[PDB]
Design a protein around this ligand. Structure first.
Ligand SMILES: [Mg+2]
Ligand SMILES: [Mg+2]
Ligand SMILES: [Mg+2]
Ligand SMILES: [Mg+2]
Ligand SMILES: [Mg+2]
Ligand SMILES: [Mg+2]
Ligand SMILES: [Mg+2]
Ligand SMILES: [Mg+2]
Ligand SMILES: [Mg+2]
Ligand SMILES: [Mg+2]
Lengths: 257, 256
């Protein structure tokens, strides 16, 4: 089981077998990657930073509990530049959370190490009040325009949607980024290449307001059985999405409360 | 906003304009369909049974919360054959849940009114002890074999879209139906149509056992952030899937 695999992994790590390590580590689901990593002593963590790129390390951090508390120093032991690149690769919702956990000093220092484009989304979402949709949503969603074909929509997905949180829902917006429709991937794939998105999209797209209370958001997810839900401002501008995996954590919090 | 839509609907009922009703009703998400239905009296409800086919009504009952002390009455007030056909169209996990909320007699009643095939999976999952994986899983999952092209896989996916519980995780089983791997529709979409499933499938497949406690299943879905999780027996035979939307109800239950 888990034990066996981790043991082999620890050995490739010590013997500094970079490629063997990478193959094994990267074969693990990001949650298992997190457990393995959270078991390592400070020495082995360092080696690990040498065999994984900031993007790869970010995939794992996305799921490590930011309240862990051993944060601060996980990031501290990292070369500031490396940490910053890693924060810039995590999903925005997770990045914002990490930052709000570090001491007020670290937060600005790491944030300072990022370019304008790298910190852009992180800076917007930091503004949202804790426990509101804006505070638990993320920016990596897929949006397209109506007067496009499925062939065209499907091209974005295949060659231009690697950064997206999820592609299982495709949101349709107009030029001003107004949310005007939605189409699930499962409805999309069964349509002809030439069909126009505008002809098969759903006009009754359900969304929440960026200032709504997480509990209300959770209720929407609970009622509609959605794996994600779009977030907008009063003007209906698509700002982000809240995913079911995070809502579960929210639900866990409300209960324990 | 929602109160208005419902008004235009209730109106098509008092007017008995089947076509107009169906176009407005079927435009709603099944949850809103459920609320509309649940706010009707005996007679508009009856009208609804006339304007909706069993599988259409099933699409809605799938999300109607059993334990609602009305199922007994909802099913009772509708034509036996109609109600039976509606059970056969609901997703298996939900059909089993509804049946177990009905009087031992009624359960037998509708059960007997179903063909061997219509009731197959229903009767299989009916024997699973309450609160175990088997008791909260469903059978409408998509499985494929490792030695085929992505194109072949996609072909199967499109055909299952309409019936499967979900097509976002595709399970790979062997000739004997042993769970050997898994691949997400997302990975399929970004791979070349020529690529062989066996070359891109994930070997480390996470699963749970039919007898596992729902709480443990809930924990697994919580940690791995899964939309669904496969269920097997001790011999690794893929028996079904437990989806995230249902695990949330489990979690609500486990809480207070
Ligand atoms: Mg977190
Ligand atoms: Mg947050
Ligand atoms: Mg639900
Ligand atoms: Mg959505
Ligand atoms: Mg998230
Ligand atoms: Mg139910
Ligand atoms: Mg229990
Ligand atoms: Mg059940
Ligand atoms: Mg989780
Ligand atoms: Mg279900």
């Amino acid at each position: 089981e888990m034990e066996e695999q981790f043991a082999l992994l620890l050995e490739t790590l010590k013997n500094q077998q970079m490629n063997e390590f990478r193959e094994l580590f990267l074969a693990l689901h990001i949650y298992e990657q997190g457990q393995f990593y959270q078991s390592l002593d400070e020495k082995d963590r360092q080696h690990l930073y040498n065999y994984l790129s900031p993007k790869e390390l970010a995939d794992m951090f996305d799921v490590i509990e930011e309240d862990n508390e051993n944060m601060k120093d996980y990031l501290a032991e990292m070369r500031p530049s490396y940490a910053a690149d890693m924060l810039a690769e995590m999903y925005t919702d997770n990045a914002v959370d990490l930052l709000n956990m570090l001491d007020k000093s670290q937060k600005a220092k790491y944030l300072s190490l990022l370019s304008s484009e790298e910190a852009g989304e992180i800076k917007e979402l930091l503004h949202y009040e804790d426990e509101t949709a804006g505070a638990i949503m993320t920016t990596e969603f897929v949006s397209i325009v109506a007067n496009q074909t499925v062939r065209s929509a499907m091209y974005v997905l295949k060659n231009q949607a690697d950064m997206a949180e999820t592609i299982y829902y495709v949101y349709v917006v107009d030029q001003e980024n107004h949310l005007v429709g939605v189409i699930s991937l499962r409805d999309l794939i069964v349509n002809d290449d030439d069909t126009l998105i505008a002809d098969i999209l759903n006009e009754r797209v359900i969304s929440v307001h960026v200032g709504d209370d997480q509990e209300d958001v959770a209720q929407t997810i609970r009622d509609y059985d959605f794996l994600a839900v779009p977030v907008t401002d009063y003007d209906d501008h698509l700002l982000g999405i809240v995913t079911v995996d995070d809502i579960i954590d929210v639900i866990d919090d409300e209960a324990a409360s």
